[PDB]
């Protein structure tokens, strides 16, 4: 019987890391429920970020902030679900998933979005920063919300997710203010693109879209895009600033 | 949250 | 601080490994040319199985049969390019690729496939057992050829690959001779199923098909399929032998 | 063989 | 902030795998107790091999043979303890540990050693064979019993461990019968070495020894060595066959 | 079959990672010579931090500051050779090694250590945070230099390494200025402790000492220690400044 | 069985 | 640096 030769030849240039995405989620469950589910239920994530002011967290023997690793990074966690981004579509295969405990109340039929604790946001920063350093093909647009990859289906991590702050720490994509203002006035003067051209621009950014786009769907798209990039209003209504941000984003990250 | 098998 | 807790909870039920496919190739080039490629060129493979009698392998200093790991399995090789199988679509992300040295000819319009060495196969056999035992979602239909995943675009590993032999060593999918026979007889008696009924049946096995299949495609489909499961004749024409096997396969290995 | 992806 | 370059330069020749040992243990506990302990208690192993005829195994929802992975292979399981072999001494750092459920009754003050189930031994074979193929510096003498690395302290996996059978499947070291017979008659004629030279021979094989060797200790050494290599008598008494096997072993594996 | 169950049970409490040390080196050679070495020669390192102004780095095509991974962390580099620290003894098995390019001179009998670049340090800083956050048993005394683990045999990373600077970035061990001062004063007042009392205190910090320490050794000990914790003067002679720190250290970071 | 920390 | 082991 043979053994493998790991020393004669190593591929240098033509290889890659499997993981190229980083999905962000919230639990909607307190720590105890949260931890049990992602451990035995029907979903998991690689990393779990708890809220320190959570009676179930303290009850567990915890007090300060932690970062839990549940599923190895090399392994595949069941977080993303049926999803799409760049030109990929089973994002579970190909992403690390971070989950943060946050008591986002359910759709019957209106959403409640609690703030994140300051400690949690700091954790997230250092964790994402650590991940981003070791996965080269994981580029600014490839850090995404679940709402971004499962449009219509999911609403996490919600509009209380400080995306812009993260960017300033080197995490994820954000637009230059000047560029937004240019697209703002260009559309204020020339009018918005028709829905068709807009979609292409959305798909160009990273959104996995259908062929047939419903009014309802377009609205969910706008809404999902808003929560990430213009959180101060996530109507799903197409307005000038929202398009401007999108177009400003495409200009900045031509990919 | 959520939500895929094996 | 802050450091990651790898110990307080581990996911058990709801997770997996990233890799669920094994893909076989022929190099089509001697040792020297193939190693130089896969280490530094525009493609790679996790594993390389040399032919012990190829003069450039001897002239490199090796005597016996080896197995070279070029890219570790946690990493992603560029071995499969644009592909598709069992509803996934970019198989470098989700597979391990194995490459064997073998001088096929391709660019005449007319193909020639030389036989593999016995030592090459024993290596290929024990290497593939080793991997399958470590990736639970690598079910038998998931040991596939480059031809099967990139139909009409590639011809490796070729019709000289002893697929049934591997099947007997617990590697990959193959029919019961009795179940094929029952389909064989029934197909002669009642005729073949509609075209739409057969394309659907190819899908179920794993073949990634467009919405509409022209007759050019159908050929490539039938042909690439026959190189694997009916090597004796891969003209690429609809057949009873052929259909009887496709059905015997996806009866034995259904959803 | 061949042949990156995406 | 930077990212790491994994593509410009890869070390080929001067590197290694961390793991170079494979320790074999028994549980002394039925499946249920066994699994709970190595999962939450104060010890663990990488792999767990159950006995299928164990009411606690069936009660768990199992019937046929399995191989459980508890601790990743890249991670460090707490199995070996305070130990020594080759010229290393915290073998936990540097080995994979396999644990097999076996009801070895305790020392108050006499040992009871149950047979292993035929199914278990087969598992072990295929598992060890898989490991040995991926860790090049893990050579025949580096597959060991806990009794071999923690001499005096531990008695697992016991003399019902079919070491010779394993060897014939390519696992671990064993002596040629002819060589044993030569050392048998050479000592029958020239007399045994003095205890001092014997020790050197033991240390030469792999045994981490003290400076000061007690009568009691030498006995434990003999006993531990016996259980692995002459299971038909593990007195701890120095006899000709035992030395002959040792010396026959050193001759075969000059390392 | 038989395939490994990676899902039924995972160890939680009783396990760890193999790696628990980080080791720093200087290359002592330009880029070209150092990369050629560590990839193909008789030693390697997991990570390589180039000097952006070394002409052979420019002449290779790189402009800015990089970090090269040569050996993945799951694998074992040959960076530390025969060594010892905190009761372990062969630190390639249990460490990640980092190598920086820096032209020290050694073979005159008389040593010269050039300063590192600022970009080299920021890399070294963020690379070492990244690692420490992922290996829980890499406590602060476990970020060490090659000098500290192979005393009297090696001089890297040298006295130009900004150890305290890293300490402020949460990398490695360093004293409170107040706790040193309390020892400083007490040592002047009451005299220094016995020789045997000081060797013991060096052990407690982590230094791997023989049973008997000659005065040659003691020098190498004191000197290699001072290159790390009292860079300003590493003549290698017993001192009050010196002792006061050794005690301040192992008061702050005891068992 | 047995039996080391962290 | 330097400098395998064992």
CATH number, position C69: 3.40.80.10
**E25 labelled as ligand-binding?**
yes
| Residue numbers in E near F93 (CB within 8 A) | 18, 88, 93-94
Rounded Cα–Cα distance for residues D2 and C146 (Å): 9
A75 and A191 inside one domain = no
Rounded Cα–Cα distance for residues C12 and A70 (Å): 9
The verdict on C33 touching A (C-beta cutoff 8 Å) is no
Rounded Cα–Cα distance for residues C87 and A84 (Å): 13
Count Cβ neighbours within 10 Å for each residue of F107-117 and write b for 16 or more, e otherwise. eeeeeebeebb
> Which of E129, E144, E172 is the C-terminal boundary of a domain?
E172
DSSP annotation string for E88-127: BS-TTSSEEEEEE----B--SS--B-PPPPHHHHHHHHHH
- Phi, psi (deg, nearest 5) at residue F62: -80, 145
E156 and E190 inside one domain = no
> Which of F137, F172, F207 is the C-terminal boundary of a domain?
F172
On whether the CB atoms of residues E100 and E22 are closer than 8 A, the answer is no
Q: Is residue C7, in this structure, part of any structural domain at all?
A: no
The verdict on C42 touching A (C-beta cutoff 8 Å) is yes
Q: Which residue has the tokens 């580029």?
A: A139
Pick from F12, F14, F76, F171 the residue to mutate for testing the C interface (most C CBs within 10 Å). Answer: F12
On whether the CB atoms of residues F207 and F225 are closer than 8 A, the answer is yes
The residue among A71, A81, A84, A20 whose CA lies nearest residue A45 is A71
On whether the CB atoms of residues C7 and A69 are closer than 8 A, the answer is no
How many Å is the Cα radius of gyration of chain A? 20
Q: Report CA-CA distances (Å) from E234 to E136, E193, E223, E226, F155.
A: 32, 20, 5, 5, 51
The verdict on C35 touching A (C-beta cutoff 8 Å) is yes
Diameter of chain E by CA atoms? 75
Q: Which residue has the tokens 């040298």?
A: F158
E104 and E183 inside one domain = no
Rounded Cα–Cα distance for residues E159 and A49 (Å): 49
Contacts of residue E186, Cβ cutoff 8 Å, sequence gap at least 6: none
Contacts of residue E203, Cβ cutoff 8 Å, sequence gap at least 6: E209
Diameter of chain D by CA atoms? 18
On whether the CB atoms of residues E49 and E123 are closer than 8 A, the answer is yes
Please write down the HEC assignment for all residues of E23-86. Answer: EEEECCCCHHHHHHHHHHCCCCCCEEECCCCCHHHHCCCCCCCCCEECCCCCEEECCCCCCCEC
Q: Is residue A165, in this structure, part of any structural domain at all?
A: yes
Length of chain A: 255
Closest Cβ opposite residue E1 in set A4, A12, A170: A170
F224 and F150 inside one domain = no
The residue among A85, A32, A81 whose CA lies nearest residue A59 is A32
Helix spans in A98-210 (H) = 118-132, 146-149, 163-168, 177-190, 195-205
Q: Is residue E10, in this structure, part of any structural domain at all?
A: no
Number of domains in chain F: 2
F120 and F246 inside one domain = no
On whether the CB atoms of residues C192 and C243 are closer than 8 A, the answer is yes
Q: Is residue E253, in this structure, part of any structural domain at all?
A: yes
Query: Do C and D count as touching (3 or more CB pairs closer than 8 A)?
Result: yes
Task: List residues bridging with F47 in a β-sheet.
Answer: F69, F98
For residue F196, give both structure tokens: 């045997």
Phi-psi region of C195 (alpha: psi -120 to 50; beta: other; left: phi over 0): alpha
C206 and C225 inside one domain = yes
Angle made by CA atoms G3, G6, H4, in degrees to the nearest 5 = 85
For residue E211, give both structure tokens: 């400076």
Taking an 8 Å cut-off on Cβ atoms, the answer to whether H6 and E14 are in contact is no
Pick from A136, A138, A169 the residue to mutate for testing the E interface (most E CBs within 10 Å). Answer: A136
Q: Is residue F235, in this structure, part of any structural domain at all?
A: yes
Q: Is residue F9, in this structure, part of any structural domain at all?
A: no
The CATH number for E219's domain is 1.10.101.10
Length of chain B: 6
For residue E103, give both structure tokens: 């009801």
For residue F92, give both structure tokens: 């390639």
| Residue numbers in F near C4 (CB within 8 A) | 133-134, 136
Catalytic residue set of E: 99
On whether the CB atoms of residues A89 and A208 are closer than 8 A, the answer is yes
| Residue numbers in E near F27 (CB within 8 A) | none
The residue among F202, F199, F211 whose CA lies nearest residue F229 is F202
F22 and F129 inside one domain = yes
Q: Report CA-CA distances (Å) from C212 to C150, C196, C223, F62.
A: 17, 10, 18, 49
Q: In terms of residue numbers, what domain contains F177?
A: 173-255
The residue among E51, E130, E157, E45 whose CA lies nearest residue E91 is E45
C185 and C207 inside one domain = yes
Q: Is residue C11, in this structure, part of any structural domain at all?
A: no
Annotation marks residue C73 as catalytic: no
C65 and C78 inside one domain = yes
Closest Cβ opposite residue G4 in set E78, E146, E153: E78
The verdict on C122 touching E (C-beta cutoff 8 Å) is no
Q: Is residue E221, in this structure, part of any structural domain at all?
A: yes
On whether the CB atoms of residues E130 and E22 are closer than 8 A, the answer is no
F88 and F201 inside one domain = no
Q: Which residue has the tokens 């400080």?
A: A162
How many Å is the Cα radius of gyration of chain F? 20
> Which of E172, E192, E222 is the C-terminal boundary of a domain?
E172
C/E interface, count of CB pairs below 8 Å? 8
> Which run of H or of E encompasses F148?
helix F146-149
Diameter of chain H by CA atoms? 18
- Phi, psi (deg, nearest 5) at residue E169: -90, 5
F183 and F84 inside one domain = no
Q: Report DSSP state, residue C48.
A: E
Per CB distance under 8 Å, which residues of C are interface residues toward D? 25, 42-43, 78, 80-83, 90-93, 146, 154
Q: Report DSSP state, residue H5.
A: -
F58 and F157 inside one domain = yes
Q: Which residue has the tokens 């029934």?
A: C186
Resolution to 1 decimal place, in Å: 3.0
Per CB distance under 8 Å, which residues of A are interface residues toward D? 14, 16, 86-88
| Residue numbers in F near A133 (CB within 8 A) | 126, 130
| Residue numbers in E near F94 (CB within 8 A) | 93
Taking an 8 Å cut-off on Cβ atoms, the answer to whether C130 and E133 are in contact is yes
The verdict on E129 touching F (C-beta cutoff 8 Å) is no
- Phi, psi (deg, nearest 5) at residue A164: -65, -45
């Amino acid at each position: 019987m043979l053994t493998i030769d790991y020393n004669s030849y190593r591929t240098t240039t033509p290889y890659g890391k499997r993981v190229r995405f980083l999905v962000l989620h919230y639990t909607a469950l307190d720590f105890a429920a949260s931890v049990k589910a992602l451990t035995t239920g029907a979903a998991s994530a690689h990393y779990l970020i708890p809220a320190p002011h959570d009676p179930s967290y303290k009850a567990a023997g915890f007090k300060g902030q932690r970062i839990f690793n549940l599923v190895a990074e090399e392994d595949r966690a069941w977080h993303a679900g049926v999803s799409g981004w760049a030109r990929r579509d089973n994002l579970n295969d190909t992403s690390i998933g971070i989950e943060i405990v946050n008591l986002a109340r359910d759709d019957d039929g209106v959403f409640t979005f609690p703030d994140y604790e300051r400690s949690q946001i700091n954790a997230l920063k250092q964790l994402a920063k650590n991940i981003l350093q070791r996965y080269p093909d994981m580029t600014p647009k490839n850090v995404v919300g679940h709402s971004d990859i499962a449009v219509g289906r999911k609403s996490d991590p919600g509009p209380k997710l400080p995306w812009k702050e993260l960017y300033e720490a080197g995490i994820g994509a954000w637009y230059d203010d000047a560029t937004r203002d240019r697209y703002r006035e260009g559309f204020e003067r020339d009018g918005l693109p028709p829905r068709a051209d807009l979609l292409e621009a959305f798909r160009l950014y990273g959104y996995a879209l259908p062929a047939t786009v419903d009014d309802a769907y377009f609205a969910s798209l706008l809404r999902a895009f808003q929560m990430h990039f213009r959180p101060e209003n996530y109507d799903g209504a197409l307005d000038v600033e929202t398009a401007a941000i999108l177009y400003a984003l495409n200009e900045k990250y031509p990919a | 949250x959520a939500x895929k098998x094996x």
